[PDB]
Each structure stands twice: as structure tokens, then as C-alpha cells.
Paper text:
In contrast, in the identified IF2 state, it is fully ordered, with R730 interacting with the N-terminal end of TM3. Multiple different configurations of the AE1 dimer were separated by 3D classification, of which three major configurations were refined to high resolution: IF1/OF at 2.4 Å, OF/OF at 3.1 Å, and IF1/IF2 at 2.9 Å resolution. Analysis of different states within the same AE1 dimer clearly demonstrates that the two subunits function independently. In the OF state, TM10 is well-ordered, with R730 facing the extracellular space. In the predominant IF state, IF1, TM10 is completely unfolded, with R730 inaccessible to the putative substrate pathway. In the IF1 state, TM10 is unfolded and the putative substrate-binding residues fail to form a well-defined binding site; our simulations also show that anions merely remain near the intracellular vestibule. Recently, a study was published by Su et al. in which they reported the first high resolution structure of AE1 dimer in the IF-OF state in the presence of bicarbonate; the IF state of this structure corresponds to one of our IF states (IF1). Extra densities that correspond to phosphatidylcholine (PC) lipids (used for the nanodisc reconstitution) were modeled in the structure. We also modeled two PIP2 lipids at the interface of the two AE1 subunits. Lipid headgroup densities are seen at the intracellular dimer interface on the two sides of the protein, where they bind to patches of positively charged residues. Based on the distinctive shape of the densities, we have assigned them as PIP210. In the OF state, K743 in this hairpin forms a salt bridge with the 4- or 5-phosphate groups in the PIP2 headgroup, resulting in its structural stability throughout the 1 µs simulation time.
Anion Exchanger 1 (AE1) is an elevator-type transporter that plays a key role in acid-base homeostasis of erythrocytes. AE1 mediates an electroneutral anion exchange by counter-transporting one Cl– ion against one HCO3– during its transport cycle. Human AE1 contains 911 residues which are divided into two domains: an N-terminal cytosolic domain (CD, residues 1–347) and a C-terminal transmembrane domain (TMD, residues 371–911), joined by a flexible linker (residues 348–370). Similar to other facilitated transporters from the SLC4 family, e.g., the human electrogenic Na+/HCO3– cotransporter 1 (NBCe1) and the fungal borate transporter Bor1, AE1 operates via an elevator mechanism, in which the transporter switches between the inward-facing (IF) and outward-facing (OF) states by an elevator-like motion of the TD relative to SD.
Author numbering:
A (entry chain C): 371 to 743, 751 to 891
B (entry chain A): 405 to 505, 515 to 688, 702 to 732, 751 to 890
Write the structure that this text describes.
């Protein structure tokens, strides 16, 4: 799949030929309760980031790109990707790096007196050209140089960021509504409460903790000996939806305390009608777009392409591992072409360009994974779950009566569950756990029996240093340099690490398969 | 010697303060943390100096708490003075001991399972009561006075109590798991898990201590070697009454509660000590004498978690030191007054949940929900039909339901008699329903 055929668009045609013969099975394998449970789970997992990032985007760009734009982008691009993608289990949506770039480019346009929504159009043009060139010459073969080292550093960092951000949201709730002796019990609640409210922070904490606990307990019950096997598996596959329902009902019967609920736009409208309309004129809206910027849009285009390419391709590598028991194949070239070209086209309508996100895609793949009776029997690979998730995200503006009843703390508990369950299957996390167990309890794995304990710990420590560096870079005003700092783990593995470790240790600690 | 003494001291102190808090809350501090601590100390010193088996641990238990609550409820119903009725029960206990001077896994496990259920149910009931005192409301009155206790609902009190209870229970459970996990050096892991309950109490007490604005009810502890409620009573209880004359008819009917208390203490000795008689006589006599001073009667219990002359002397000094420290723990009133009752509720739930482990009735109740292919390789699974074992478990569950109904009614004082009625049930009716092989598998001494 990552070989170079020497022909123009050879990898793309190979991906299409390999995956499209499976289309009827991609439709029919969706007929299972597990697929429906995964649809509900991933629908919440995909809607909540869209709303959060759309709110932040509207705040940071003055509603030139807001919540409705991101919802429409996610829905349409997810539908097209589920219909035409070589790896239908990838979930394409907004991410933190994309928001950071949008902020930086909006700042640049404001400083230089340019229209931000037209500079985005030209960035999209350049993204289309660049991805077409990369797929013509099969540049996705470079993905073969990203080994388990980089894949697992990236996955662990993303999971840690997920968990940290949900906890920071909870801490923010506690900061807005601190526990006080007295309150101004007639606080105004529009648009959001203007002052501290009693019981709000503790109730949010309780709701998050209860959702997390019920999800984890139903996960345990799925793999337990209780109840008939089929009913047990069905109930445990609906574990996350059941926990969400339980906690939403708990919140529904407490009418006196305030908790923040999901908010969606009132309709399918642009966030700022005065700023721009549905279709962006590339030559400008209220002023002529400069030619020098028409050409200089190639560097922001290169940065955006690097971000999207790295994120999506590492996600594809993670979900397509041989251990996970995927058998229908994955197309790096086709998926890259689809995602980047769709983002470039969406820039022409003012919508965000998206990326195959790591935690969401891994959660989607795990929700479709069938556990054999501590082993992975198979994965329900099909195009219906992602299609239905994208359709539901595109219909969320019409689902206000239901979504307005769902607290954000329940979804925080679900996000904590996603973050913790995404750590499974990552050998870096296993080796981090081994740092605390005595050597006599270390598992029977090649890197435990073939590598001395202190050398394996040193390997894990170098990886932890890489993680710390990445976290610091992400926390600084140089956050946009993260993709390059992560790319630096490839030369670190292929050049620096051989100077420390021996070949046998490096093959044991960085094996292609487990 | 010192490490074991510290471990035993904390193992004695945690249940002591938990039960003292519950008992002081129920009885309006007629008996509370101070009385329980002083009784434990004095009776432990006496048992370390005189008790034939110095390895036995004498202290308050869940059955004793249940009986104390039932007797307080009965005295409230009949307008009697509870602390004087206790004195006459103690007189009768002493008389019974002077007069004196069969229990199978069936009865023992029904008893322990009932106590566990009571602990869990009482924890949740206390939390519900807290939520009733301080409902979640849009608005509150900030002029609420707090001299005896909050006179109206307060914000964050019920939710914070729930959080403290849940956190204490979760930390105790997590440290219990960590005790037997593969993490950290074995010695440090086992030491940390040994003191798991104290550590969880400390963590949640600190959490509550650094939250200063919200109110949570705390332990009621006097300053010094004093009674929990001086206005209600003093140290010496005059048998004829403190505020009202004590009825003579009750002076004679105190023999029945005395018999029930004797049954409970003997049952606890059988469950723990057996799994001897003079030690039980000493404990019952000491409890009867302690009732004269308004202090709880205790019960001896095994599983202290430990040339012949030297060994006995060493464990006699261990009990003497632990009892002296438990008596001096009332001087740690600055620390004890900072312990929220929700933390102790979490510890109560932890005790109830963790005592379920090792009960074959609980294991068979779990098997009720498992497919037969998943049933373990135990004699009552392989030598008994699945439905016969399930019928055995169901009859035991019916016993539990009858005991719960009795505990719920005004006749809850007679609960020990209904418990002892499971001995005739095991010996008479069960042989009619079941075969000897099934009774040997389902009710075994090992
Ligand atoms: C709503 C449930 C009603 C019961 C279901 C209605 C049907 C019913 O009567 O179930 C009886 C069931 C035993 O199930 P049963 O023996 O018929 O079949 C077993 C099991 O149910 C699965 O079929 C297989 O185990 P798994 O696939 O590896 O797991 C295995 O079949 P196979 O491997 O040979 O092919 C069998 O061992 O016993 C309970 O679990 C108690 C119910 C829980 C308590 C429920 C009441 C509180
Ligand atoms: C607060 C921690 C302070 C650590 C202080 C000092 C920590 C420290 O000294 O490290 C050595 C230790 C290895 O100990 P080591 O291998 O020598 O000894 C093993 C094990 O630790 C127990 O001693 C025994 O296992 P168990 O009895 O059957 O359970 C067994 O000894 P035995 O069977 O032959 O008798 C041995 O297998 O490493 C860690 O386990 C975690 C490190 C801590 C993790 C990193 C902590 C940041
Ligand atoms: C497991 C036990 C959890 C117990 C939680 C106790 C909450 C403590 C609240 C302190 C007072 C307050 O809420 O204050 C709000 C403060 C912000 O400070 P401030 O009020 O704006 O100003 C300072 C005013 N002081 C100095 C008077 C306070 O936010 C916080 O930093 C608290 C964040 C709590 C995060 C909860 C993490 C839960 C972990 C479990 C995850 C499932
Ligand atoms: C996530 C936060 C991480 C920090 C918390 C974990 C602490 C781990 C330290 C105890 C491990 C242990 O005790 O392992 C026991 C092993 C025993 O193996 P040995 O071959 O006999 O040792 C040979 C002794 N040398 C090394 C002197 C030759 O000793 C070790 O050499 C531990 C590995 C030390 C190398 C550096 C490890 C990476 C540092 C931690 C990651 C930043
Ligand atoms: C860990 C599992 C915990 C389960 C136990 C929870 C106990 C709650 C008992 C409430 C009943 C009650 O007491 O209701 C009290 C008030 C009614 O107030 P009122 O109508 O003004 O009447 C005034 C008083 N009365 C009724 C005597 C007249 O209602 C409430 O605000 C309760 C809110 C319940 C939220 C509980 C949190 C849910 C957590 C879910 C698991 C994470
Ligand atoms: C905790 C509150 C009680 C709730 C109990 C809910 C679980 C009920 C199902 C148990 C497992 C099961 O299904 O039992 C199945 C057993 C197995 O029979 P077998 O012929 O040996 O199996 C071999 C052939 N099979 C598999 C085709 C049947 O047969 C029974 O029906 C047991 C019922 C006995 C009656 C007394 C039950 C008492 C239960 C407690 C009520 C007071
Ligand atoms: C919604 O947009 C208005 C208008 O934005 C301005 O006009 C557009 C046509 C486009 O050229 C934008 O870049 C302009 O900023 C926002 O109101 C503007 O606020 C900025 C900052 O204070 C100010 O420079 C503009 O003059 C304002 N324009 C007007 C007409 O008041 C408004 O903030 C946006 N809404 C939200 C919620 O952010
Ligand atoms: C301390 O005790 C007082 C008084 O108890 C009295 O004496 C006992 C021996 C017994 O006869 C009781 O029934 C007597 O009440 C408690 O005061 C009572 O408090 C409750 C609860 O607030 C109230 O309903 C009663 O009316 C009060 N009775 C009197 C006579 O004042 C007091 O609560 C106890 N203190 C604590 C901290 O628990």
C-alpha cells in the first residue's frame, strides 16, 4: 500500500482498486447493534468537538468562521469521505492545530489589512494543487518512514491532551462558579450566567464522574461472565449510550441547579452575515485581493498541508495496524487526496478544512471492534457508521430540543472515557506502566525478555522526553511548529537511537507488529 | 512490635470513630465517640491483663450498633431513658454471666450478609437525609444560623457530602486493590494498602479542610475525658433515672434485651473467635459493668492481623499499648473535630462492601446471575445441581428478607432471636428439603 509504483496516480488507483470491490460488504456489514451503538457514541464524540471549536473559532475570527460553518463542513466532508474513502473508519473533523493556524492567519490578515476569508480561499487553492501533485507522484510512500516510535508518541500526546483538556474544562467550571458561603441568588442567566451559582460546579463534577464510572463499569460488564453472552455483549456495546442516558436523566430531574447544556446554531446560516456570504469570491469581497498574497498563500498552504497530512496519515497508520484485525485495506493516497481536496474546496465556501482526527478515529475503530472469547476477533469495517455520524452532525441544528437537555459534564465524562480507552494498545503506555512495576511482574513480551530492564526504561524515558518537548512546544506561542517537532522523531529514531541502542533492542522496542 | 502496634491501633481507631459518629448522631450523643473510645480503652486494658486469649480484639461492631439503634428507638417509642435502660440491661448481663459461671456457616453467613446490607443501606439513607436537609435550590437564605447546627438549607452541602463520601469510598477501594497489585515494591505496596482506610480518611479530610466556605457536619467530640453531651448525662448513670423515674416493669423486662445482647455477642464470638467461653464471659461482664457508666458493651473478634510464655507476654503488651493509645485518642480532639461525617459514611460503605468478600452466600448470589458454564470449580457447584444450589440460596435470601422486615418494624429489637431461629431451620427443615451430600457441600465448616 505504501510502495511506489512509478506511475502517475498509481497509489490512488491502487487504493481504489483494492477497496472498492468491498463496497457491497461495506454497506451490509453495518447491520448489527454494535454499529448502532458506535454510531451514537461517535456522534456525540464528533458533535461536541465541532461545537466547542466552532465557538472558539467564532470568538477568534469575529464570526467569519463559526459553529454553523464547522457543522456544515464536518457533515458534508464526512459524508463524502464515508462514501468515497479507502478507510471509512476515519472520522474527519476540526482539531486544535487547525484552530491555532486559523487564529494565526486571522491575526496576520488583520495586521496586513487583508480579508481573512479570501486568504483562506487562496490557501485552499494551493492546498488542492499541492495535494494533487503529491498524489500524482505518490508522495504518500513517505508514510513508511513513520514507525511505531512516532505513531505512539503522537497517539499518546493526543490522548494526554484530550484528558488534560477535559479536566481543564472542569476546572474552568469550578472557577466560574466557586464554592462560596453566599451567592447573588438573582444572577442573570443570559447569554450565560453572569456570576457564580451554587451547586453548579459540584453537580458538574458529579455528572462527569458518574458518566465516566458508568461507562467504565459497562465496559467491564461487556467482558464479564454475567448474564447470557449475547445480551451481555449487546448491553456492553451500548455502554456509553446507556451511561449518557443515565446521567442526562439524572440531570433532567434536578430542575433547580444550573448546568451548561449543548448549544447549536438556531439555523443553517453564516455566523456573520455582514462579514461574508455562503460563497467567497476569490478576487475579494469589499477590497481587491493583492496578487503578492495570491502567491504568498503557498506558504500557509504548505503549513496547513503538513498539519493535515501528518495528522491524517498517522491516524491511518494507527487504525490500520495488523493487530487491530482490519482486512479490507486502507488507502493513504485516496484518503489524503479526499481530505485535503475537500478542505481546499471548502475554503471556497468559507468553511474549515478538516483532518482525520486521532482520538475520534481510534474510538470509532474500537467501538466497531469485536473481542474474541483478551483477543481481537475482527472489526466491523463498513461505510454506514461514519456516514450516519456525519449526517447526524449535519442535522444537529434541527435536533436542538434533544441536545439542549444534554449537560456538558456528561460529555466531559465521555471524553475522559475516550481518552483513557485510547491508551490501550500503545506500547509506550505499557512501558510507562512498567516503570512502576518491579521487573518480576513485567509481561512476557520481546522487549521485556530480550532487553535489559534499565535499557527498556531508558528507551521509554527518551520517548517521555520527546513527549515533554512536544507538550512544551504546544504550550508556547510556537505551537504551530508542532508538526515539524514531531517529524524530528523520525531522524531521532533512524539516526540518533542506533547510536544508543543495538539493532535487536531497537527491533524489539520498535516492532512493526506485535 | 511498634509497627504492629500502630497497625492494630489504626485498625481499632477507624471503626471506633466511624461507629462513634453514627451512634452519637443517632442517640443525640448520649453515647458517642468519647464514650466508645474510653470503653474500648478500658475494656481492652482489662482484657489484655486478664483475658485468656490476649490475641482477641474487643470493640464495637456492626451488630452492636444495630442493637443500640434499635434499643434507642424502642426507648424513644416508650418514653424511657435509653442510658438507664442500658444500665439495667447491664445488670442483667452481669446476672446472666454469674448464672453461667450449633452455629454453622448458614447462620454466620446470613448474619454477616445482613450486617453488610445494613451498612450499605444506612450509608445511602444518611446521604439521602443530608440531601433532604440541604436541598439543591436556585436560591438560599444567607442569614442561616449555625449555633446548634444549620437552621436552614445551605448551598453545596449535600453535593459536597456526596463527593466526600464517594471519594473516601473510592480511595479506600483503590488502595485495597493496590495492596494486591503488581505496582511499587512489595513491602511499600503492602504497607500502603494496610493503612488504606486511614490514608483515604486523611486525603478526604484534607480535601474538606481546604474547602473552607462550604459547610459539612463534623464529628462531635468533647474536650478531654468528658461525655459527648454533658447536658444530657454524666459519667455515672443512676439506675432509678436521671430526669424521670425508671419504671420497675422495665427493671424486670431488661432481661429480654440483655438476652438478645448476649446472643449477639456470642454470635460474634462464634463467627470470629471460633472461626474461649471464659473470654466471652469476661467480655459480657465488662460490658454489663460498662453499662453502669453509660458506655458501650463490646464484643471480642478474631483476625487481629498478627517460648510460649514469651509469645503470650508480647501480645499482652501489644493489647495494653493499643488500648492506652485508643483511650488517649480522645485528646486528639482538634484533629477529630475536623473529620466530616461524610468521610466516615464512605468508610462505613467501604466496610459493608468489603465484608461481603469471603461469604459463600454472596458468591452464590453472584452465581445466580452467571451462566452455569462460568460457575467456579467448588464442591457446591460440581456436586450439587445448579437449581438445587439456587434453591438453597433463595431460601437464605428469604431468611434475609424476613430479617430485614423484622428490623424495619417496632419489633426490631428481637432481631437476634430471629437470627438464632436459623439454627433450627438449618437443623430441621433443611434436611427435609435437601440431601446430606448437598448440605455438606452447601454448608461446610471449611
Ligand atoms: C433477561 C435475562 C433472562 C435470562 C435469559 C433467558 C434465557 C436463559 O434462561 O438464560 C439462562 C442463563 C444460562 O444461559 P444458557 O445456559 O442457556 O446458555 C449459555 C449462555 O447464555 C450463552 O448461550 C453461551 O455462553 P457465552 O456466549 O460464552 O456467554 C453458552 O452457550 P454456548 O457457548 O454453548 O454456545 C451457554 O453456556 O443463565 C443466566 O445467565 C442467568 C440470567 C441472568 C439473570 C437474569 C435475571 C436477573
Ligand atoms: C514512592 C516510591 C519510592 C520508591 C523507593 C525505592 C524503589 C526501588 O527501590 O526500586 C526498585 C524496585 C524493584 O524492586 P526489586 O526488583 O529489587 O524487588 C522486587 C519487588 O520490588 C519486591 O521486592 C518483591 O516482589 P513481591 O514481594 O512479590 O511483591 C521481589 O522481591 P523478593 O520476592 O525476592 O523478596 C522482587 O521481585 O522497582 C520497582 O519495583 C518500582 C520502583 C518505584 C517506581 C517509581 C517511583 C517514582
Ligand atoms: C475527589 C475529590 C474532589 C474534590 C473537589 C473539591 C473542589 C474544590 C473547590 C475549591 C473551591 C473552588 O471551587 O474555587 C474555585 C477554584 C478557582 O479558584 P477561585 O474560587 O476562582 O479563587 C480562589 C478562591 N479561594 C482561594 C477561596 C478558593 O477552582 C479550583 O481550582 C478547583 C478545581 C477543582 C477540580 C476538581 C477535580 C475533581 C477530581 C475528580 C475528577 C473526576
Ligand atoms: C512518568 C514519570 C517517570 C518517572 C517515574 C518512574 C521512575 C522510574 C525509575 C525507577 C525504575 C526502576 O526502578 O527500574 C529498576 C531498574 C533495574 O534494572 P537494572 O538493569 O538492574 O539497572 C541497572 C542500573 N543502571 C541503570 C545504573 C545501569 O533500574 C533502572 O536502571 C531504572 C532505569 C534507569 C534509567 C533511566 C530510566 C528513565 C527515567 C524515567 C523516565 C523519565
Ligand atoms: C453514588 C450514588 C449516589 C446515590 C444517592 C444520591 C442521594 C440523593 C438523594 C436525593 C433525594 C432527596 O433527598 O431529595 C432532596 C431534594 C428535595 O428538595 P425539596 O423538594 O425542596 O424538599 C425538601 C426536603 N423534603 C424532601 C424532605 C421535603 O431533592 C434534591 O435536590 C436531590 C437532588 C439529588 C441529586 C443526587 C445526585 C445524583 C448523583 C448520581 C450518581 C453520580
Ligand atoms: C437476587 C434476587 C433474586 C433474583 C434472582 C434472579 C436470577 C434468577 C435466575 C437464576 C439463574 C438461573 O437461571 O437458574 C437456572 C437453573 C438451572 O437449572 P438446571 O436444570 O440445573 O440447568 C440445566 C438445564 N438448563 C440450563 C436448560 C436449565 O434453574 C433455575 O431456574 C433455578 C431456579 C430455582 C428456584 C429458586 C430460585 C431462587 C432465586 C432467588 C429468589 C428468592
Ligand atoms: C460580525 O462582523 C461584524 C462586522 O465585521 C466587520 O465588517 C465585515 C464586513 C468585515 O470586513 C470584518 O472584517 C469587519 O470587522 C463585527 O463587527 C466589527 O467589529 C470589529 C472589531 O471591533 C470592528 O473593526 C468593525 O468595524 C465592526 N463592524 C461593525 C459593522 O460593527 C462583529 O464583531 C462580528 N460579530 C461577532 C460576534 O464577532
Ligand atoms: C444533648 O442532649 C440534649 C438533651 O437531651 C435530653 O436528655 C437526654 C438524657 C434524654 O432524656 C433526651 O430525650 C433529652 O432531650 C439534646 O437536646 C435535644 O435536642 C433535640 C435535637 O435538636 C431536640 O429535638 C430536643 O427538643 C432537645 N431536648 C432538650 C430537652 O433540650 C441535645 O440535642 C443533645 N446534643 C447533641 C449535640 O446531640
Amino acid at each position: 500500500p505504501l510502495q511506489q509504483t512509478g506511475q502517475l496516480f498509481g497509489g490512488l488507483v491502487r487504493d481504489i482498486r483494492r477497496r472498492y470491490p468491498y463496497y457491497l460488504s461495506d454497506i451490509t456489514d453495518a447491520f448489527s447493534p454494535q454499529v448502532l451503538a458506535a454510531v451514537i457514541f461517535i456522534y456525540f464524540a464528533a458533535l461536541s468537538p465541532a461545537i466547542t471549536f466552532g465557538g472558539l473559532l467564532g470568538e477568534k475570527t469575529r464570526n467569519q468562521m463559526g459553529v454553523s460553518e464547522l457543522l456544515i463542513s464536518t457533515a458534508v466532508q464526512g459524508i463524502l469521505f464515508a462514501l468515497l474513502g479507502a478507510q471509512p473508519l476515519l472520522v474527519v473533523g476540526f482539531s486544535g492545530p487547525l484552530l491555532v493556524f486559523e487564529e494565526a492567519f486571522f491575526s496576520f490578515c488583520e495586521t496586513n489589512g487583508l480579508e481573512y476569508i479570501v486568504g483562506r480561499v487562496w490557501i485552499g487553492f494551493w492546498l488542492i494543487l499541492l495535494v494533487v501533485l503529491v498524489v500524482a507522484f505518490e508522495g504518500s510512500f513517505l508514510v513508511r518512514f513513520i514507525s511505531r516510535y512516532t505513531q505512539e508518541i503522537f497517539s499518546f500526546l493526543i490522548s494526554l491532551i484530550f484528558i488534560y483538556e477535559t479536566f481543564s474544562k472542569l476546572i474552568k467550571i469550578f472557577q466560574d462558579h466557586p464554592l462560596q458561603k453566599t451567592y447573588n441568588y438573582n444572577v442573570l442567566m443570559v447569554p450565560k450566567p453572569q456570576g457564580p451559582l451554587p451547586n453548579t460546579a459540584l453537580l458538574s463534577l458529579v455528572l462527569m464522574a458518574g458518566t465516566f464510572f458508568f461507562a467504565m463499569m459497562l465496559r467491564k460488564f461487556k467482558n464479564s461472565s454475567y448474564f447470557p453472552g449475547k445480551l451481555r455483549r449487546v448491553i456492553g456495546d451500548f455502554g456509553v449510550p446507556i451511561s449518557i442516558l443515565i446521567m442526562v436523566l439524572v440531570d433532567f430531574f434536578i430542575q433547580d441547579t444550573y448546568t451548561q447544556k449543548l448549544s447549536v446554531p438556531d439555523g443553517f446560516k453564516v455566523s456573520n452575515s455582514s462579514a461574508r456570504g455562503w460563497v467567497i469570491h476569490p478576487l475579494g469581497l469589499r477590497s481587491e485581493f493583492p496578487i503578492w498574497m495570491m502567491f504568498a498563500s503557498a506558504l500557509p498552504a504548505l503549513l496547513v498541508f503538513i498539519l493535515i497530512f501528518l495528522e491524517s496519515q498517522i491516524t491511518t497508520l494507527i487504525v490500520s495496524k495488523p493487530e487491530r484485525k482490519m482486512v479490507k485495506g486502507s488507502g493513504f493516497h485516496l484518503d489524503l487526496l479526499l481530505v485535503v481536496g475537500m478542505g481546499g474546496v471548502a475554503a471556497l465556501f468559507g468553511m474549515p478544512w478538516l483532518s482525520a482526527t486521532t482520538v475520534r478515529s481510534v474510538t470509532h475503530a474500537n467501538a466497531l471492534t469485536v473481542m474474541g472469547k483478551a483477543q481481537i476477533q475482527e472489526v466491523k469495517e463498513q461505510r454506514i457508521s461514519g456516514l450516519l455520524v456525519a449526517v447526524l452532525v449535519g442535522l444537529s441544528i434541527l435536533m436542538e430540543p434533544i441536545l439542549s437537555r444534554i449537560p456538558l459534564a456528561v460529555l466531559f465524562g465521555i471524553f475522559l472515557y475516550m481518552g483513557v480507552t485510547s491508551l490501550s494498545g500503545i506500547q509506550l503506555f505499557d512501558r510507562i506502566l512498567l516503570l512502576f512495576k518491579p521487573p518480576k511482574y513485567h509481561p512476557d513480551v520481546p522487549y521485556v525478555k530480550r532487553v535489559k530492564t534499565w535499557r527498556m526504561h531508558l528507551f521509554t524515558g527518551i520517548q517521555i522526553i520527546c513527549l515533554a518537548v512536544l507538550w512544551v512546544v504546544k504550550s508556547t506561542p510556537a505551537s504551530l511548529a508542532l508538526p515539524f517537532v514531531l517529524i524530528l522523531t523520525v531522524p531521532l529514531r533512524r539516526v540518533l537511537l542506533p547510536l544508543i541502542f543495538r539493532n535487536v533492542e531497537l527491533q524489539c522496542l520498535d516492532a512493526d507488529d506485535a
